[model samples]
Target: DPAKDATPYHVEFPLFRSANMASADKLSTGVGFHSFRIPAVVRTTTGRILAFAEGRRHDNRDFGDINLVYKRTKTTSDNGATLSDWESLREVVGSGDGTWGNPTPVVDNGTIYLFLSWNNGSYSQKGGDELPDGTITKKIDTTWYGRRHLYLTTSTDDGNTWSKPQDLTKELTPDGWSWDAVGPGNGIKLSSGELVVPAMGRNIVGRGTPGQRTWSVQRLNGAGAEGTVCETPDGKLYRNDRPSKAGYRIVARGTLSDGFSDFASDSGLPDPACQGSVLKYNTDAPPRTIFLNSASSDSRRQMRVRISYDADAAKYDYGRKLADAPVSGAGYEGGYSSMTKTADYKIGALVESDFFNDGTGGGSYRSIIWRRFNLSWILNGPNN
Candidate 1:
């Protein structure tokens, strides 16, 4: 079946699902066997699908530090398009106040860089009051609460080999507390060849629910031409809103192509707020092309998405109004995922949650899907 678009709107081709969803037993194999976030890339040389995500170990900790996971579509399973088909290429553990989590990778001129959150030093557990006559006590590891830093690992031989991580935490250490300074979002390369990483600002020492201070690369003296920082529309709220304080953080882009030069928000395409994903579509006729996807955000509590597309120019047209990520019991998690297009305009996005079965809770799983064409095949007929 096809998905729908807006007026004068385009029609969706056939939609597809990802690998497979894990069974309850398999999901519980780890404390949290599901993945929370993902970043995507399509190889120009070969139409290969490569995705990276944050995998949580079943450690049963509150703040689950993530492990970076990768899978190449070519090596899928018997049920290739299912969740079980995806395999782990590598797992970089977080260290020294860093817990390897939220993996985002970028390939520049053939060099692959995988960036993730890192922690220096080991985690120390918090102990509860000892009961009575020295019997026993319960303690919890504060690793999740410990300050987080961002670091990068490089690979030269496709996915076979990797290099040690390079620390990017040195630039923002002045705040006393280490910061969850990287990978809630992803990073990209500007046309000018600078790195742009989107990150949040929560005081490490200050004990609060966690204030949102969104920042990015500062191209400053101490800063490495580019790095992480809090982005805010009003003052400096982490993520995109500041429900806790009046100082709100909207979307703050950098001079580096408004923080991303490789792509931009098209005019007609709907705006899916600041954190949504966008796609690039190319056509046969003219030289015109633009970005796709739409978003809306009133606050952390209120957010909406209108699937959109762009023909040309900065305009992004919207599609049907997607439900506001259903309530907890509404029987939907709303899912977390991504999408991309091959050179020929074949669309592929992360799957699973699109069905709204399990967006937040259920084990992390996604389908790799794309849209197909009816006219072209009929017009061009069989292979020439």
Candidate 2:
């Protein structure tokens, strides 16, 4: 049965299911937490798959008691190009009612470093606005919202355990930033061993610490935010950003091989101002790069994956749609996505699914989805 033994190119499963066991079942979905956001996935040096996310407690608000949670494969599940069971949801960082979110993980030399952003539970980004004096007003402080700090933790046992979070705010973040957020996704490890985490900072007008360039943090330019970085085959880096404006995606190129240039817009990639994911799918012969996002020019409803054979993303010939055409359905696949290359030379992605009470946002049930596919499936389809 050699034909039957062939690898299954694509498979999918739900990360957060529709089950409510109890009010205090921290691990169960639809109970303690109604939604999960910010899906991030990465493969360890040992080939174990680790999927990270922000468990939005209570509701789907960006702030509040959101905890960084993760689930790893019990064994090399996707290694054989097949689906396998994943370990139950486990909390990586969270205590009391404080908000811990933005799971940005990077693996280097057998150590998986997980970076998170922390703020008091009372704070919410949903209603922040600037005052007459230009000072921002927030729910928690009214005058000064609770400061956001960056924390880092490491795991050496292939994500089996993690170290206590250590504060890196003072060292990494600039001063006077009214708002800060480290990737709500993952970082890229360049071939030169440099780790670049896509980040964003607001109110950067002469507010940074002396000698700390504020623009360097918000580098993608053109109202860019929440970006993801990928290394090209030529050893350079390409940081693709989520633009605040509609239409095109902002891209910045530079790294060890080539110094970073000013950010520019790429019309080839259509977006609706949503977070996307990028990965260097293959660095050999043909050298492939993959980009994923809501390809619609106006909505976060069309989730598409594009493959580029060029190092600078000059062209994207192969395109495939991951989610079905939007319809009145319970689970609509859209929003933030994170991707990583699997051990079996396939693409693994963690995409977001929202079950809005209505067709649009209301009281919604958000969840994460794990999807695995390959290049053949992407190229064989009709051109997008």
Candidate 3:
């Protein structure tokens, strides 16, 4: 059958807007964020949706005085789209000026473990850029004080309160990699009960009981950039990641017992070297896998959602451009995206859109759009 013309049960709206503009919206953030980036979302054991991001205090530069902030669903599951459905924004970390980012969350035995990357406020991934205030940035150095550090925090009471973060830099990240990050999206707990956190060049695997787990770094030497992982129907790990540069999506498959295969540049999925989201949708007869990203090699505008019947499959079964949907239109510009299966069995995506970006006069006003759609909606695609 040809793909249908009408989408099934789709919704899209901004979940986070710059405090500079959407100030009328009650939950903007008490701390005054110029923009929000690196969205990470997850559904809890109790049917609540938790959306996390780096609250960029100054601008959208990806560094300097960024804090981890999130919003929990006041209503459950599918209703998080409405502005009133979310609780007031809450700060997870960031006391003094510093950077806390890369929110990779995994729910295991009812506990939600969030992995984050931290660095000093004065340091940046690439330096020498002058700020609007005339202050020049310093490149991140190799010293422990200057490089990115990994941390772990947990929420046992659904997505309400989180425990103080425990530093895992020495425990999980091997030295010499001055720059590092966990999934700017969600992690996964395999059928064998091991929780895996995706990073730039490695996967951090967690073992032992919930809340008492020990983590070990599993290196993926060939993979040299941001990554996303999902377990295949046959229990193999499938990683579809951004390459070290702007190229095709990097694809690989394996098990923790045996190492992953050599990275393959998947021509089927086009990327502009931006972060993407992939997750196991369900373990039905076909066992669907869902992926979302800006589907282009030179731009982050035409965001698309793809469906793969088998997680280990290299080519997606079908895909649809978000712009095709009537609600979003062709003007949709998507950057980093995060996806999770909502409690109601729909795909809930927290996607970064500089739709309201004002990169002038020391301002970078960005927002995150929450899009929720079901498998039927994705399948109705007039292909990407």
Candidate 4:
């Protein structure tokens, strides 16, 4: 109380709150799915904020009646300062009992292109007992196991409404891929106007690398189950995927025409093999690149954000932790995250968080939080 010599203060330079809360039941709006995961937020050219995620219906399983859902802020230029300012949750795409997820969105021209992956809900990705309807485990056969396909949808009116998804499977998916996935995160729009969707797949018959996961790009002509893309200051494109067995993130450079160079492990960035987000902070000369991940060699709970001064990610000059230390009886505050530069020279992020009952067993509530901060707060903190 002020009477006790405590002065009231307001947080300057952005704040935090729940953007989407966990639902206990399936509501008629389609968002009341069991849980929400994999958040992607972007600003349209008109300055409208669009937030996207997978409405994990039934349960937390990746497969099943999952659908792509979203919400948009009504204010034209506000930085989503509060949760009540955002519109109600809405389901953009849901097909029968099939699954639609991986919200990879990029704003191009005046339109926002959102890409997703779909598979019949009858099949399970982990290969288990099929549903009572006689559906089999996930397999390569289209007639039995149900195939995975890539699809794209567009929103021209600032995310208020979206077009029906149009399949791009024929042009993007190779013939032998048994399982495929697009980004569960955001896509990058190159200064050159090219849109790249980070994608990965598992090929049939153990081709090429022998049971290896193939990471590649899917452009308009071009292709993550969990990947992020960004353009380097040098005007080249880089797609970084979740770490493989090597324990470091795999970096794919160049474009579809120039052909991507050999996948290399970014030694400077050690990961626990988790999904992360990368973005071009500014396009000025010498440029700036911002990367975010768990920054640990074994866990997905130590989410951190780093900045590359020379636009060379191999050596990061400054960094800071974005959340509290991992306590045994607190909550789950880290996992998949997405970033975007705000119109007022601030950084906007949508991060995954779960309210754990006793710390690490299971969540009492799941949510995506919106955080708006400035570079000053980041650089001023301790760095490595």
TM-score quality measure for candidate 1: 0.52
What is the alpha-carbon lDDT of model 2 when measured against the actual structure? Answer: 0.70
The digit string of per-residue lDDT tens for model 1 on 1-384 reads: 022121121122112222233322122123333333444443322444556555443321223344555555554122124344444444444333224664555545455566666543233123343222333323333333455555667765555456787765555333444344343333444334444444443211111121222233432222211122222222221122111122222222234332222222223322223234333233333322222122322322222222222222233223322232132222222223344444334444432222234533334343222222222221222220
RMSD values for the candidates in order, in angstroms, are 11.4, 6.6, 2.8, 8.1
Q: Give me the candidate number with maximum lDDT.
A: 3
lDDT of each: 0.35, 0.70, 0.80, 0.65
lDDT of 3 by residue, 1-384 (tens): 122344577888777766655441233444678788899999888788999998888777787888898898996654575667878778888766778999999999779999999988777889876655677778877788888899999988887889899988888888877888888798999988899989978899998977678789889867755889999888899888887788679888889998899888998888999999998887767677888888889888778899876547667855878776533321245889999888877788888866444543346567788888877787866653
Give candidate 2 misplaced runs (Cα > 4 Å).
Answer: 1-8, 18-31, 77-84, 126-145, 201-223, 256-258, 324-330, 358-362
- Which candidate leads in TM-score? 3
For 114-157, candidate 2 gives per-residue lDDT tens digits of: 87888776555644643323444355422334677778888989
TM-score of each: 0.52, 0.84, 0.92, 0.82
Tens digit per residue, CA lDDT, model 4, 166-255? 887766767656677777677766665556667773111101231231233333222234667778877777777786553777776765
Clashing pairs in 2: none
Task: Give candidate 3 regions above 4 Å deviation.
Answer: 1-7, 24-29, 77-81, 131-133, 326-332, 356-362
Task: Give the distance in Å from residue 113's predicted Cα in candidate 2 to where it truly belongs.
Answer: 0.6
Model 3 sits at a Cα RMSD from the real structure of 2.8
